Amino acid sequence: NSSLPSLRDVFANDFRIGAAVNPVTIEMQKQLLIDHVNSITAENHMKFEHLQPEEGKFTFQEADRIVDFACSHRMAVRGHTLVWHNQTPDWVFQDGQGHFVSRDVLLERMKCHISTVVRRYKGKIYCWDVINEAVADEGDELLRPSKWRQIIGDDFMEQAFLYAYEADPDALLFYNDYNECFPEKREKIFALVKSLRDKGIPIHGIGMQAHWSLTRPSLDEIRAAIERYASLGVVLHITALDVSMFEFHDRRTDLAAPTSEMIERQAERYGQIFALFKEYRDVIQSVTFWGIADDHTWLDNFPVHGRKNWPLLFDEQHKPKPAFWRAVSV
């Protein structure tokens, strides 16, 4: 590493380089983070269930640890995430009888949560994924079904953004989602954000999760999505980048190690990805990987539980992979 290029420095004039972490991985991959990133995202500890597990009971300990680590190393922090159909406790949508609360009650709870969480980290966290994955990933419908939407109505997103803006008007507020480059979903996301923006809703950016594979999405699809979203006048952040060695249909579990072909194609894939990102440096301001080294990745258990994946730039021994060299040489 002594002579190894530093990711954040390599892209100093293009965009921040980040990593999703948790207190455990911060310790386990501490030096890698210190040497390469200038932005941090909580992989799970800033999600609803990990911040307010019970009404009125806030558990900021793990999140505080992540933020402290970031600030002590002059690293920016992205807040993930306020309103999502996943990892949100049941109490949020129920009353005493266990029945669903009303629209006004859920809005009160939403505002209180957003207000409390956002205010605590105001001045330390510069952006927030306010709404996460609201768009349907399948079907002809625009929106995915969720208790938030069901109880409040389709304007639940408008309210979420307004609440966050009030809590910290200096923060950049994002709509974050995956499969953001497949045409059908891209158009739904574009339509949604455009509609919010056309209503004066304070949404400042679109978060492209980029949970990609070696083949999907294509570079043309990525370029088209970047341009389509950028045309709305919003800032763009790649928020959870990883390049899986397995396509969606590939559910093998025997592979103890990636083939030379996989490693080679991944290197090419990452080089092409970053060449494209650099080309659009004017609209892309941050690129965060959902992790940093192959010794820790949510893809080891998703979508197939119990297997192993090698989706990042560094291997399990924290050594640069072929993908690292192509990525930093664009």
Ligand X SMILES: O[C@@H]1[C@@H](O)[C@H](O[C@@H]2CO[C@@H](O)[C@H](O)[C@H]2O)OC[C@H]1O
Where does this chain bind Na ion (CB under 5 A)? 15, 281, 285
**Which residues between 216 and 235 bind ligand X (CB under 6 A)?**
216
Residue 178 contact, options Na ion, ligand X, none, Cβ 5-8 Å cut-off depending on partner type: ligand X
181-194 core/surface letters (b: 16 or more CB in 10 A; e: else): bbeebbebbbebbb
Burial class of 261 by CB neighbour count within 10 A (0 to 12, 13 to 18, 19+): exposed
Reference 282, options 234, 218, 222, 210; nearest CA is: 234
Work out which of 240, 284, 292, 312 binds ligand X, going by CB under 6 A: 240
44 binds ligand X (CB under 6 A): yes
189 binds ligand X (CB under 6 A): no
Work out which of 9, 119, 184, 248 binds ligand X, going by CB under 6 A: 248
209 binds ligand X (CB under 6 A): yes
Q: For the beta carbon of residue 281, count every other beta carbon within 10 angstroms.
A: 12
* Region near ligand X per CB under 6 A, out of 25-33, 58-66, 68-76, 209-217: 209-217
**For ligand X, which is the closer residue by CB, 247 or 316?**
247
Amino acid at 65: R
**For Na ion, which is the closer residue by CB, 59 or 285?**
285
**Which residues between 59 and 118 bind ligand X (CB under 6 A)?**
none
Structure tokens at 73: 């190393």
Structure tokens at 223: 């370029």
Helix (H) or strand (E) holding 131: strand 127-132
Tell me the closest approach of the beta carbon of residue 129 to ligand X, in angstroms. 7
Work out which of 179, 266, 286, 288 binds ligand X, going by CB under 6 A: 179
Residue 15 contact, options ligand X, Na ion, none, Cβ 5-8 Å cut-off depending on partner type: Na ion
| Residues 275 and 287: beta-carbon distance below 8 Å | no
Sequence-distant contacts of 6-13: CB under 8 A, at least 24 apart:
6/35, 6/36, 7/36, 7/37, 7/313, 7/327, 7/328, 8/36, 8/37, 8/38, 10/328, 11/278, 11/287, 13/281
Residue 128 dihedral angles phi and psi, to the nearest 5°: -135, 135
- Name the residue number minimizing CB distance to ligand X: 298
Tell me the closest approach of the beta carbon of residue 247 to ligand X, in angstroms. 8
Tell me the closest approach of the beta carbon of residue 252 to ligand X, in angstroms. 16
Structure tokens at 2: 């002594």
**For ligand X, which is the closer residue by CB, 101 or 299?**
299
Tell me the closest approach of the beta carbon of residue 232 to ligand X, in angstroms. 21
Site for ligand X, rule CB under 6 A: 43-44, 132, 178-179, 209, 211, 216, 240, 248, 290, 298
